[PDB]
Design an enzyme around this catalytic site. Structure first.
Site, PDB file in Angstrom:
ATOM      1  CB  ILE B  18      49.817  27.370  92.333  1.00 26.86           C
ATOM      2  CG1 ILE B  18      50.100  25.888  92.582  1.00 26.86           C
ATOM      3  CG2 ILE B  18      48.499  27.782  92.973  1.00 26.86           C
ATOM      4  CD1 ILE B  18      50.179  25.521  94.045  1.00 26.86           C
ATOM      5  N   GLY B  19      50.286  30.020  91.178  1.00 26.06           N
ATOM      6  CA  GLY B  19      50.072  31.451  91.058  1.00 26.06           C
ATOM      7  C   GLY B  19      51.366  32.239  91.102  1.00 26.06           C
ATOM      8  CB  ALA B  20      53.161  34.379  89.646  1.00 23.36           C
ATOM      9  CB  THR B  21      57.360  31.540  91.229  1.00 28.93           C
ATOM     10  OG1 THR B  21      57.842  32.587  90.379  1.00 28.93           O
ATOM     11  CG2 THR B  21      56.835  30.399  90.372  1.00 28.93           C
ATOM     12  CB  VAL B  22      52.720  29.678  94.118  1.00 27.00           C
ATOM     13  CG1 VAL B  22      52.105  28.507  94.866  1.00 27.00           C
ATOM     14  CG2 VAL B  22      52.910  30.869  95.046  1.00 27.00           C
ATOM     15  CE  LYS B  35      55.645  34.258  99.511  1.00 29.88           C
ATOM     16  NZ  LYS B  35      55.147  35.018 100.692  1.00 29.88           N
ATOM     17  CG  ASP B 133      48.063  41.386 101.780  1.00 37.30           C
ATOM     18  OD1 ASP B 133      47.256  42.207 101.297  1.00 37.30           O
ATOM     19  OD2 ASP B 133      48.770  40.633 101.077  1.00 37.30           O
TER      20      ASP B 133
END
Lengths: 267, 267
Positions: B18-20, B21-22, B35, B133
């Site tokens: 998905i994203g960045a 680890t995901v 995550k 955040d």
């Protein structure tokens, strides 16, 4: 310690009633800007039983399960606070006003997929959890038509092969024949209950309703009577329904399987 | 009797990244996001931070906060498991091909309102939780366009009036002036972040993005600079954005007040 799931009764601003039951009334309420639904109990070893429904809802974290948001633990007004689903129960929804235009075939099947996903989550807890009372009335609808499983009061933990207490509670129109006969049952009993719910979403009819509890126990329980499926029904959908109604509980499909059979039926 | 929120790594069938680890993953049929904690991050101090993040998410139960579903706490790959939101982050979504066409004013304002509900929930918890955040990338979009708050790795509980032992950390584009300057921060710092997020939803512009982190610290933190608000922008929406960018944090509106201002703007 502190899991922060304890709510003071003064922090809740109660609003209009939204439902009724043996346990007590249920109102929509405002909680620090947030819109929640409160389950107040009638003003008994049940005090210990209440803590059970609370301890078990804290163990449930799934998008297709009614979101538990805390509870009031001080009498007399004990209550279970959860998120508010503005569309009420799927039962009252299927038989109200015009639902043909509002709820098209694709939407109704999707609603069933939501149920299966949540039910699949339950059966895969440790130990697994049997709902013991899965019905249309106990399924609530989201503003965006997402269906979540609710009312875990009669929900017990299944660590053994079968259920233990023999409490044998639940709505007769939706209970499995083995349960109606008041004999050992397992997670497969819920699968049958789902069979009925799928039938409702598929045919838009009310199960029985010309029969009282006793007559249901007799017919479906001891006389192998089953709901009628119209020849007009989608064979693939009928197939899933008939599978959930198999007289041999172990022959009924798991919710995991039910998801695999429904996924392609959508679109 | 157990937490039932502890997951073994072998129970997760990892899927695409998905994203960045995901990673996306199938968990007992369910569909979740993972995550993962890096290999070289497996040490005392870093793992404790992990445990804090897990502790906090167990204390969060709200429709606009990403649903925590479990956590792998055994090496290797100590990860945090949550529900999966298929439309990704609000950031990627706002800066995608055919954006305006895809998102009308009403919907964009509703997404802003969703963030406001979840943020008000945080600040209203006891003790209150400052996100520290808040930004577009840390906002995930549900399949039906529901927005939820994510990434509490920096989120801390504020017992006192301000955060004790303030730790310099965050992302420049969204950080409030007092934060940029490493000063005593509170929940009003999140309010500022929100203003930027609303500014993104209103203009579909990338905040700054013509400046590097240092230029931002100088501009916003020490030069009283703010993002440029378009002339053709809704005066009532602009009024809200400006209110969040007040030099003095106390003069900024609470998320509770923000909701009250947005609700009418959604007809």
């Amino acid at each position: 310690d502190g899991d922060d799931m304890d709510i003071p009764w003064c922090d809740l601003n109660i609003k209009e009633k939204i439902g009724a039951g043996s346990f007590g009334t249920v109102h929509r309420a405002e909680w620090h800007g947030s819109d929640v639904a409160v389950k107040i109990l009638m003003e008994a070893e049940r005090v210990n039983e209440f803590l059970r429904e609370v301890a078990i809802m804290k163990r449930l974290r799934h998008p297709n399960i009614v979101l538990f948001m805390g509870a009031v633990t001080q009498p007399p007004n004990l209550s279970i606070v959860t998120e508010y689903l503005s569309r009420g129960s799927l039962y009252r929804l299927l038989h109200k006003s015009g639902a043909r235009e509002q709820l098209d075939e694709r939407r109704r099947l999707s609603m069933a997929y939501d149920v299966a996903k949540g039910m699949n989550y339950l059966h895969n807890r440790n130990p697994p959890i049997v709902h013991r009372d899965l019905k249309s009335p106990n399924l609530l609808v989201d503003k965006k038509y997402t269906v979540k499983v609710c009312d875990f009061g009669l929900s017990r933990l299944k660590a053994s092969t079968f259920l233990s207490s023999k409490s044998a509670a639940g709505t007769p129109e939706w209970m499995a024949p083995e349960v109606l006969r008041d004999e050992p049952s397992n997670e497969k009993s819920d699968v049958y209950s789902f069979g009925v719910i799928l039938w409702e979403l598929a045919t838009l009819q009310q199960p029985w309703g010309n029969l009282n509890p006793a007559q249901v126990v007799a017919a479906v329980g001891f006389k192998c009577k089953r709901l009628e499926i119209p020849r007009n029904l989608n064979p693939q959908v009928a197939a899933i329904i008939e599978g959930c109604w198999t007289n041999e509980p172990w022959k009924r499909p798991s919710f995991a399987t039910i998801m695999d059979l429904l996924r392609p039926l959508i679109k």
